[PDB]
A paper describes a structure:
Small electron transport proteins that bind FeS‐clusters are called ferredoxins (Fds). We recently showed two distinct ferredoxins, FdC and FdN, were essential for iron nitrogenase‐mediated nitrogen fixation in R. capsulatus. We discovered that FdC is the first [Fe2S2]‐cluster Fd involved in N2‐fixation under anaerobic conditions. FdC was shown to interact with an oxidoreductase of unknown function called FprA, encoded within the same operon as the gene for FdC (fdxC).
Numbering used by the authors: -1 to 95
The structure:
């Protein structure tokens, strides 16, 4: 009934925020103090890498750009870029990678 909102848990700070769907993880991490770093405005640096603990199915699929910057920065199977990863619904749990 609230399909336009999603819960996002930053486990390094133990807080779950209810975000409007389509919000990027980086747009909440600094609001709660999570240690995810915003280091560029072009999606190329990869310093915003984030480990997706749960709920990867509720996230926007990675673009070809994200995949390239992920691989360039040794991102793993469950890592995503916080400045490019949008929460589309459901429940997601993340920690700084
Ligand atoms: S902040 Fe640079 S890739 Fe996300």
């Amino acid at each position: 009934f609230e399909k336009d909102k999603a819960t996002l848990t930053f486990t390094d700070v133990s807080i779950t925020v209810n975000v409007p769907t389509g919000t990027r993880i980086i747009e909440m991490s600094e609001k709660v103090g999570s240690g995810i770093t915003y280091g560029c405005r072009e999606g190329e640096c990869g310093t915003c890498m984030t480990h997706i603990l749960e709920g990867s199915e509720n996230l926007s699929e990675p673009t070809a750009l994200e995949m390239r910057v992920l691989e360039e920065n040794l991102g793993g199977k469950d890592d995503r870029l916080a400045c490019q990863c949008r929460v589309l619904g459901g429940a997601v749990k993340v920690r700084p990678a």
